Amino acid sequence: AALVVDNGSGMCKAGFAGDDAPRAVFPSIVGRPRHQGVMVGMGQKDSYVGDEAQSKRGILTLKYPIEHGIVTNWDDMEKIWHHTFYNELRVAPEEHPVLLTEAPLNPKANREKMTQIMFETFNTPAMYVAIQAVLSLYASGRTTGIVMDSGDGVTHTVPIYEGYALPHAILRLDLAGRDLTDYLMKILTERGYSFTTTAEREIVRDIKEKLCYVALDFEQEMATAASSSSLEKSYELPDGQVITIGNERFRCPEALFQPSFLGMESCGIHETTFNSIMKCDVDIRKDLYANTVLSGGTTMYPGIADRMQKEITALAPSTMKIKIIAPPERKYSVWIGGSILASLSTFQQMWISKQEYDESGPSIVHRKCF
Amino acid sequence: AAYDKFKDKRVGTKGLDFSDRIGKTKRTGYESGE
Amino acid sequence: IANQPVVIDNGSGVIKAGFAGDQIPKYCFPNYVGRPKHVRVMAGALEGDIFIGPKAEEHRGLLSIRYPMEHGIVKDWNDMERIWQYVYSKDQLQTFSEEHPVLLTEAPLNPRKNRERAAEVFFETFNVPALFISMQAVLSLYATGRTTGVVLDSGDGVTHAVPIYEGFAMPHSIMRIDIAGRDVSRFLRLYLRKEGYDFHSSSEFEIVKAIKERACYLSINPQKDETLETEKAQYYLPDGSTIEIGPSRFRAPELLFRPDLIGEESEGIHEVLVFAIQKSDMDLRRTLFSNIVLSGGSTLFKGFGDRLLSEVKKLAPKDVKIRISAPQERLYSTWIGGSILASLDTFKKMWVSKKEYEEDGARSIHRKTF
Amino acid sequence: IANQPVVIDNGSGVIKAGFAGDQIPKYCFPNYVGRPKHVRVMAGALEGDIFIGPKAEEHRGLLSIRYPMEHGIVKDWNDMERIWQYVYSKDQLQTFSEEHPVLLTEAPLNPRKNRERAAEVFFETFNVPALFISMQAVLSLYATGRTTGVVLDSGDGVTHAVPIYEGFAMPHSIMRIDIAGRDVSRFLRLYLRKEGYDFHSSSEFEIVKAIKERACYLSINPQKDETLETEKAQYYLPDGSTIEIGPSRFRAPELLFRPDLIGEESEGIHEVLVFAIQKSDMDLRRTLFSNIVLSGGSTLFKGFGDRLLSEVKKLAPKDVKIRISAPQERLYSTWIGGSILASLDTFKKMWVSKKEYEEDGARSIHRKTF
Amino acid sequence: DPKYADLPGIARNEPDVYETSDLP
Ligand SMILES: Nc1ncnc2c1ncn2[C@@H]1O[C@H](COP(=O)(O)OP(=O)(O)NP(=O)(O)O)[C@@H](O)[C@H]1O
Ligand SMILES: Nc1ncnc2c1ncn2[C@@H]1O[C@H](COP(=O)(O)OP(=O)(O)O)[C@@H](O)[C@H]1O
Ligand SMILES: Nc1ncnc2c1ncn2[C@@H]1O[C@H](COP(=O)(O)OP(=O)(O)O)[C@@H](O)[C@H]1O
Known part of the structure; x- marks a missing residue:
């Protein structure tokens, strides 16, 4: 009996260890109303969470507590965990031990405060933090190979050989799904369709998920998109109003491969994977080329694998064979790894108990990382 | 002061070749300051 | 030749330039080319797309920094040639390159292709009368005014130790780390x-x-x-x-x-120093421990002498006198050595003439360089 | 009990192991211990911190290689003991050390303490019935099937020349170079x-x-x-x-x-061969030039025989017939000799029994060594 | 020999014996 709770900046995937899919999946967001001194009606909650905040977008100011995979507002983060445990899962944190997920090369303060809250506030019997990239290997049952776990906050590439990580080869990029949404809003406004407010930002994100796809040849696709109006598709808003996205449809995801558009002054996601392999040992490079895994929900763009294959192949040697591993279920690949690891009898020893926390302190999390 | 100490020092650059050439045994550049 | 030779200390961090006889390098600027990343909109704004030295330091925020040389190896030759052009420009020495002989100071055990291409520029692009390349360690001894001593020159780009006894250098005992x-x-x-x-x-x-x-x-x-x-x-x-x-x-x-x-x-910096001495003949080992000379900017860290002396003492034999000598002008020692050597009449015979290079070619540089 | 003796060719590069009577060594592996340098993160990762032979060759990138023996002298005995343990293990010969006698082949002119410590392992740590140490040169003669000849055995670790005439070995004419x-x-x-x-x-x-x-x-x-x-x-x-x-x-x-x-x-390798012959008495010098046997892995270079014969001809006396014979199995000649010698019934008198060692000690090995 | 041929480190397409000329 154990709980797996992924602390994603976009979506919170929670469930019991051994389960195939997460039980409770909701957006990690807090919505507080823009209330004036004028009297309000009955059934009014001071702060809404998840589906409720998504339903009442009109009045509620939506503030993500996690910014670039870092918890900015810890008080709101506790309210997300409180809704997750008590309301969504319908389980006491005192009963089951909780498996948590961290991004690589995160600030040390996150682990320190994380463990304090779970043991002190929630009084959990045990808590273990795991690397998202390491868990995704358990989902694929592969000890060797690199993973490109691209989230809403950040994107990172962690190469692991025969279940041994190369810490020097780990690369972190702040470019992620949330930055793409803000880019799409700007270029849609230039077309004519203006989106300013927090509620409108969420509507544009829902539009992005439906229409946007990755082009194989960016210049040729834009040249063809300029010529013909076959790619131009219509989208119906919550209001009767209908919009035509046009050439901007496939323009948004290009920023991942060419960050110069957003102005990141960094290398593309395909260059990050290649650069990481170059930092890795010469012998194991062959196996990393053979096992390039794509993880997270930011790699669910249609035809991203086709563009990735072309770009990596160009960078890689001509003699070398480059194989990209893109399973249908990438979105829940990190959580499934957590469920498999938590289910494994070996992991039973890895749990940090309340007694161990009290004796050692919050510094115990830093010792039992890797 | 350093210039004055090394001022009258000379080297023999005749037959000088530092390069990784195998032919003709060992070589030592800068024979003498004669 | 009546025209004074120009000393050019091609350091990874800062290039130190001046004429032979000068007490200190007059012209010291950072070794990188800054290009403006932001768009020019107004009339009367900053002219040029290339900024080198104090102009780049003043308006750093606008520019994107790009180092042409890494670990004493020229990555971008187009940029390196433009910086050498900047050394001769009105902002720096303000003299003709064809009138003055040149003294270049490269790190030991560098690739032959780097030395060959670097020389080609000063005979082809610049019509220099004569070129002589010298080792960093040998020049440091002219500055200190000692024929016998071990020179541990830890620079920004490369760290190397060269043991030299009464002028003689043991080329097999030279140790270099990136x-x-x-x-x-x-x-x-x-x-x-x-x-x-x-x-x-x-x-x-x-x-x-x-x-x-x-x-x-x-x-x-x-x-x-x-x-x-x-x-x-x-x-x-x-x-x-x-x-x-x-x-x-x-x-x-x-x-x-x-x-x-x-x-x-x-190997660690402390192992490099001792190992280089241990390779030398049994008779000279005690004298090399007695005559240790520190150079480079990377020795300026507080408690370097205290930590190094403790580490050398542990590795060094028992009952040996270990005297570590630090010149007050650690950073400027290499250049001053160049000025002292360049001022000597013996330096005239050391030269490779333009005519000599044209006849023999790249061979002349390998034959006459150490 | 007269269980078949195990021949162990303790080479610097590759150790050749097998039972007496075998035509070729069954089990040949590199002489070094590979330990994993990277950190273990996964629960299904490769088990063990020690990799020897084909497991180390396959997973080389993960491991840090360290040779226990240098110039045919065991520097780390703990590692050397584990390699002999690996010879007896399920991966290699898969037999009990207590049942079979051993035939060891060490280089000439090694320290007395080296043989003493090596012997201690096979009598104390391993309860071996009997141990016989043999010369590399003498075994090569059994493999070639010649009583008279000079054996120039240029290995990875050490190069030595032993002139042996009609069974007789001149101990003063033996030349060894590191x-x-x-x-x-x-x-x-x-x-x-x-x-x-x-x-x-x-x-x-x-x-x-x-x-x-x-x-x-x-x-x-x-x-x-x-x-x-x-x-x-x-x-x-x-x-x-x-x-x-x-x-x-x-x-x-x-x-x-x-x-x-x-x-x-x-002295050069060509001087070692000729000098060793010149040290021998006038009568035998002409026959030793007639009977020259090449061995060791460093003889496999293209045009080795052509260059060696030219250098020997210049140093050798005028109008003397110089015949240099190279067995096609240059690498395996020493071990093949071991199998031939070990198969003989006279070998029973040659080796030192466990009980014989316990009574007299190291002295017995020193008497019979040469 | 076909018996030793199985081994990886065998010399192939090489002369067995190097010898000086009998004629001056
Ligand atoms: N089918 C799709 N098409 C286009 N964009 C998509 C698609 N699916 C996901 N995305 C983008 O990817 C982002 C994150 O994916 P998501 O499905 O939230 O996985 P996640 O693991 O929850 N990310 P995180 O919140 O960091 O755990 C979304 O906010 C979208 O911008
Ligand atoms: N006070 C200091 N403390 C520590 N490091 C320093 C200090 N001053 C300079 N450095 C380091 O030394 C470098 C200077 O290297 P330098 O000796 O000029 O290189 P080179 O010998 O290759 O010309 C700087 O870039 C910096 O990294
Ligand atoms: N084909 C070859 N050409 C040249 N050198 C070789 C060749 N094969 C092996 N070698 C060299 O010979 C070494 C093998 O020496 P080896 O015969 O194993 O010595 P030992 O007698 O100590 O066991 C290799 O490590 C390598 O340096």
Whole structure:
């Protein structure tokens, strides 16, 4: 009996260890109303969470507590965990031990405060933090190979050989799904369709998920998109109003491969994977080329694998064979790894108990990382 | 002061070749300051 | 030749230029080419797309920094040639390149193709009367005014130790490692991200270099100070924002003594010095321990002499006199040596003439260079 | 009990193991212990911190290589004991050490303490019935099937020449030099660094050894091949990258004939062979030139026989017949000799029993050694 | 020999014996 709770900046995937899919999946967001001194009606909650905040977008100011995979507002983060445990899962944190997920090369303060809250506030019997990239290997049952776990906050590439990580080869990029949404809003406004407010930002994100796809040849696709109006598709808003996205449809995801558009002054996601392999040992490079895994929900763009294959192949040697591993279920690949690891009898020893926390302190999390 | 100490020092650059050439045994550049 | 020879210290960090006989280098500027990343809109704005030296330092925020040379090896030759053109320009020496002979000072055990191409430029692009390339270690001895001594020259780009006895150099006992000052700046940046301070931009990396120079001390016992709670020493950034550096001050510069921290299979700076002496003949070993000369900017860390002397004493034989000599002008020692050597009449015979290069070619540089 | 004796050829490069009567050694593996340098993160990762033979070769990139024996002298005995334990293990011969006698083949002119400690392992740590130590040269004569001949055994660790006439071995004419195959690999590495290819890692040095074995020829006239333009033979690394070796191909192996190149004050390999014959009495000198036997892995260089015969002819007396015989199984000749000697019934008197060692001790080995 | 041929480190396409000329 154990709980797996992924602390994603976009979506919170929670469930019991051994389960195939997460039980409770909701957006990690807090919505507080823009209330004036004028009297309000009955059934009014001071702060809404998840589906409720998504339903009442009109009045509620939506503030993500996690910014670039870092918890900015810890008080709101506790309210997300409180809704997750008590309301969504319908389980006491005192009963089951909780498996948590961290991004690589995160600030040390996150682990320190994380463990304090779970043991002190929630009084959990045990808590273990795991690397998202390491868990995704358990989902694929592969000890060797690199993973490109691209989230809403950040994107990172962690190469692991025969279940041994190369810490020097780990690369972190702040470019992620949330930055793409803000880019799409700007270029849609230039077309004519203006989106300013927090509620409108969420509507544009829902539009992005439906229409946007990755082009194989960016210049040729834009040249063809300029010529013909076959790619131009219509989208119906919550209001009767209908919009035509046009050439901007496939323009948004290009920023991942060419960050110069957003102005990141960094290398593309395909260059990050290649650069990481170059930092890795010469012998194991062959196996990393053979096992390039794509993880997270930011790699669910249609035809991203086709563009990735072309770009990596160009960078890689001509003699070398480059194989990209893109399973249908990438979105829940990190959580499934957590469920498999938590289910494994070996992991039973890895749990940090309340007694161990009290004796050692919050510094115990830093010792039992890797 | 350093210039004055090394001022009258000379080297023999005749037959000088530092390069990784195998032919003709060992070589030592800068024979003498004669 | 009546025209004074020009001394050019092609350092990774800062290029030191001047005429032979000069007491100090008159013209010292950073070794990188800054290009404007922002768009020019107004009329009367800054002219040129290339900024070198004080113009790049003044308007750094606008520019994207790009180092042409890494570990004493020219990566971009087009940029390196333009900087050598800048040395002769009205802002710097303001003289004709065809009128003055040149003295170049490269690091030991560099690739032959680098030396060959570098020379070609000064005979083809620049119509120089004569070119002589000299070793960094030999020049340092002219500055100190000693024929016998071990020269441990830890630069920004490369760290090497050359034992020279009464003028004689043992070429097989020379030890070179790529790890240098620039690698500590990158390694410190890693700790700043872990503490929670982001410096992604090429301009922000130069601030990290300034932070390293200001606040970093070398611990006598690294494990003791690592465990002990560190005082959070505040640094004021150019904009006004305050950052707490804390334990990263002494944990970052440790790389010089422990290359396993980054994960490179190389000897520590303390092992390089002693090992280079141990390779020398049994009779001379005691004299080489007696005559140790420190050089380079990377020795300027607080407690370098105290830590080095402790590490050398442990590796060195028992009942041996270990005297470590530090010139007050550590940074300027190499250039001053060049000025002293260049001023000598014996230097005239050392020259490779333009005519000699044209006849023999690249062979002339390999034959006459050490 | 008269269980079949195990022959163990303790070579510097590769250890050749098998039972007496066998025509070829069944089990040949590299003589080093590989330990994983990277951290274990996964629960299904590779088990064990010690990898020997084909497991180390397959997973080389993960491991840090460290040779226990240098110039045929065991530096680390703990590692050497584990390698002999591996010979008896399920992966190699798979037999009890208490049941079978052993035949060990050490190099000539080793320290007395070396044999004493080595013997202690096989009598104290391993309860072996009987141990016999034999010369490398004497075994080569059993393999070739000749009573009279000079055996020039140039191995990876050590090169030595032992003149033996009609069974008789002259102990005063034996010549041994520390410079061997492993020194040429290090000397070639220096030329690859000059070209601009770095191989700092212990795993990368094994690729340099493979490059030498694949593409390295011995020049008949060094001045001719120095003057003539050398063909740049490309070598493909595991990742796919190509290296052009060029003139370094023939410059590396020259070390064997000119030790002054590395900077060692010793005689050349060609001087060792002729000098060993010249030390012998006038009557036998002409027959020793007639009966020359080449052995060891460092004789496998292209044009080795042609260059050696030219150098021996110059040093040798005028109008003498010089016949140099090279067995096709140069590498395996020593072990084949061991199997032939071990198969003899006279071998029962030759070895030292466990009980015999316990009574007399080390003294018995010292008496019978030569 | 086909018996020793199974081994990786066998010399192939090489002369067995190197000898000097009998004729001056
Ligand atoms: N089918 C799709 N098409 C286009 N964009 C998509 C698609 N699916 C996901 N995305 C983008 O990817 C982002 C994150 O994916 P998501 O499905 O939230 O996985 P996640 O693991 O929850 N990310 P995180 O919140 O960091 O755990 C979304 O906010 C979208 O911008
Ligand atoms: N006070 C200081 N404390 C610590 N490091 C310093 C200090 N001053 C300079 N450095 C380091 O030394 C470098 C200077 O290297 P330098 O000796 O000029 O190179 P080179 O010998 O190759 O010309 C700087 O870039 C910086 O990394
Ligand atoms: N084909 C080859 N050409 C040149 N050198 C070779 C070749 N094959 C092996 N070598 C060298 O010979 C060494 C093998 O020595 P080895 O015969 O195992 O010595 P030992 O007698 O100590 O066991 C290798 O490590 C390598 O340096």
